[PDB]
Amino acid sequence: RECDYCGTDIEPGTGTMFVHKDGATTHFCSSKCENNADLREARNLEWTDTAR
Amino acid sequence: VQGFAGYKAGMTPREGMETVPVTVIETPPMRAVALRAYEQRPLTEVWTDEFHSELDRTLSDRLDHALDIVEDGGEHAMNIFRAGEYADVAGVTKGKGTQGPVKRWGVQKRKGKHARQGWRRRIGNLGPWNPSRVRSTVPQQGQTGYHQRTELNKRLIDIGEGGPYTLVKGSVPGPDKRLVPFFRAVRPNDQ
Amino acid sequence: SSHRLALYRNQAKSLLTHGRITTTVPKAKELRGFVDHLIHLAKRGDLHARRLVLRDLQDVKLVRKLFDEIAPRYRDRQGGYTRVLKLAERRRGDGAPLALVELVE
Amino acid sequence: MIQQESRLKVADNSGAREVLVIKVLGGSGRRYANIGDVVVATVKDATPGGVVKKGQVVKAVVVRTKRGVRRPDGSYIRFDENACVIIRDDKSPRGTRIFGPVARELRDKDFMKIISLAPEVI
Amino acid sequence: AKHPVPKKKTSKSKRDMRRSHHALTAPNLTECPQCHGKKLSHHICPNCGYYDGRQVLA
RNA sequence: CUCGAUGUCGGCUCGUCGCAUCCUGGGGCUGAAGAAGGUCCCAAGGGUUGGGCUGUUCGCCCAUUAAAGCGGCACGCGAGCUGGGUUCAGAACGUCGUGAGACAGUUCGGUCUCUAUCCGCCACGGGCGCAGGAGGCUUGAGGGGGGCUCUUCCUAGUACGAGAGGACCGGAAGGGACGCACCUCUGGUUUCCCAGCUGUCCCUCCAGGGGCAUAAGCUGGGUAGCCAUGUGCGGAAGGGAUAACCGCUGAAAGCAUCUAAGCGGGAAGCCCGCCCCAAGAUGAGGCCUCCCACGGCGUCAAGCCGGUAAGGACCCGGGAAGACCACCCGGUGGAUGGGCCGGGGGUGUAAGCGCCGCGAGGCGUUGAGCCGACCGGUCCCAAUCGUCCGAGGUCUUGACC
């Protein structure tokens, strides 16, 4: 994928994946993805695998 | 020397099939010093110097098979401990020190409305009026960090030599890496 | 905190000036490494390096003085550009085993 | 995780909305309701009287907790939310339908029923 | 606010006994490097300057 | 006994006994088949939950549970809180009183004090001891820790059973509270490690910084150690002596009787076992590995001196070792600190120049820069040189060379 989108990344040959309601999702990564993303609009996201 | 033992490698888990965390342990054959027997009279420890080079800077199976390696010349490679086994190790607590009856000993402290009142940590009480002065009961700020700790059901998973070393099933060696580890599988229950 | 630094600061400062002062055991034991460390930077020697060293010390004269001045007299070794020497006496009332330290020379 | 009066929504339709957590179901002591687990709480509020109704004595289980669940697969999983499903004594749901995904779990501790109803089980 | 205070004349005896475990122990000092004399085991001095390097006065 | 004064309800915490035992095992009983109850004898090990409303305990109610025990110790605990409350003056009502005041009727609010001496407890050092002087290793008498449990499965839906049900016996698995230990994975830390920021003073103008804005001014994040929300693990076998309780062999009662004598059965319980000390248990224990008879003095001079680095120490340098202390490793024939150096980890691509847009900025160089303890090299630095103390081998008896 791309930490869902968070093109950064973090935590070994395992990692981990957060998640939201509605069969929707959020595979995941670092404390730079999280919080931010968990609170607005992905599009606008830069740094990473979006505003790449 | 009746047993087998060495020091703490460290911990990490990784792989398996579901996955599982253990700990590494260092120790080839720390030579063989006499051997336990109280024969004809009182016998226990001799010393026919054959040690290191520095050591004078300070100068019936378990023990038995020993005879095997302790007469070989001294040393004795560790590892019967094989594939899936339960020895037991006795680490050395951890210079944690003299602390409050808090962690030292489970206990609830200064509640709320007074769980702060620049108030806090400190036991509740000792003994009643009539009973009699005190008990040797209630612990105290009974220092820690130095205890001759250990445990049980110590299962070893695997081992390999490159450097005689052992992989463990759940670490909790007690003491810290580079620490003094001694193992055994005492009165095992999982047997 | 802000104090640990400050120290290292003025001490690092004053020192380089003389290259061996008089503070107690520890005090010195540290002003070393640090100050020390700093040195190793005068050694690096450049835009950056300087922009740091100064960053703390704050002061052309020196800052430069060392980077150029001393730095060299050291360009060769491997840290240690300081020889922390304990002292014989002790500040009064106190009784603190002060001590002296210099740029190994 | 999830006891006293921590609240959690529905994903099924039982006719609920959210529910307060009385007891962690199992036996004495015990202090925790983690998906798969089964809770002894009630309605904090439920639709316009579907079939349940606000403040209704209840029985529900674990399927969504941001407490993070360590998968024997040294893996890790969690959710943006915390809620579960009602049940018929017979570890049997009511909501005819599901909502947000969930986790293998359930299966492991019995419930298929939802296991599949679920839009997606992670 | 004297919750707790002694309760029985401390007993000279004891008292002192207390004050007993106390005691000094002369500076372990040694003898000069070449300074010739007695110095604070490990240091130059108003007799030295040396050690190996003349880092002092007199 | 106390008024030259023992601070009183409930709560909190920390608990400790006891058994008439609530849960828990073992039993005999039943109008007990099963299952589940009832009855009573034996056993306290361990254990006996969240809320509610009430100053309360008590108590009723809510959801659990095996269980949700009775009571001691001034209905334990104020020199340990609580301090609501009954129990200072206010002041209120109601209430009696000509009144004044008043009330186990009520209602608002109403100053719980830093320095433990002794005994006592928990802890760590100092003696002196254990009769050569010496470092290393072990025994444990005797103490202390810990023991609970639900549920799920086969045996089996077989015994029983008209049926709806549901076994001893025998065996898997999970989980609950709990405790020991531990960072790997997880999460909380991260007082400066790294990054973005607005206000301001110095900085030289710009840039590039600097304190302060707590003791970091603010926000994002962040090893290493500590630490849970998290990791291992544990409460078992089994051995012996019993409760109650069940039997055998058989008197006295030529017939019966677990019975005095003889022999066995039988418990979460005692003893043992499993961890945790531990001979200062003055009965100072064992054992191995070192060190040899030095001086001169009136004596059973077991008294004064060089010693033996056997050996230790002190001083230095260091430790998840740590209040001090004691305890551990090192002391330049060293890797012990720091330093440097590679390595990892960590912040998100720097200072500069460059190239696009009037500017704001961007894009590049550039996953840059900078890096606090984590893994390991290298004598740059700094543990130089030096002291002190330390044995000799007490008396009797005998056993062997």
UniProtKB/Swiss-Prot annotation, chain C:
Keyword Oxidoreductase: no
GO molecular function: structural constituent of ribosome
Gene3D superfamilies to which the protein is assigned, alphabetical: Ribosomal protein L17
InterPro entries: Ribosomal_bL17, Ribosomal_bL17_sf
Highest rank taxon of the organism: Bacteria
Keywords per UniProt: Ribonucleoprotein, Ribosomal protein
Biological processes annotated in GO: translation
GO CC annotation, single: cytosolic large ribosomal subunit
One Pfam family matching this protein: Ribosomal_L17
HAMAP family: Ribosomal_bL17 (MF_01368)
Quaternary structure and partners: Part of the 50S ribosomal subunit. Contacts protein L32.
Membership in a protein family: Belongs to the bacterial ribosomal protein bL17 family.
Name of the protein this chain belongs to: Large ribosomal subunit protein bL17
Taxonomic source organism: Thermus thermophilus (strain ATCC 27634 / DSM 579 / HB8)
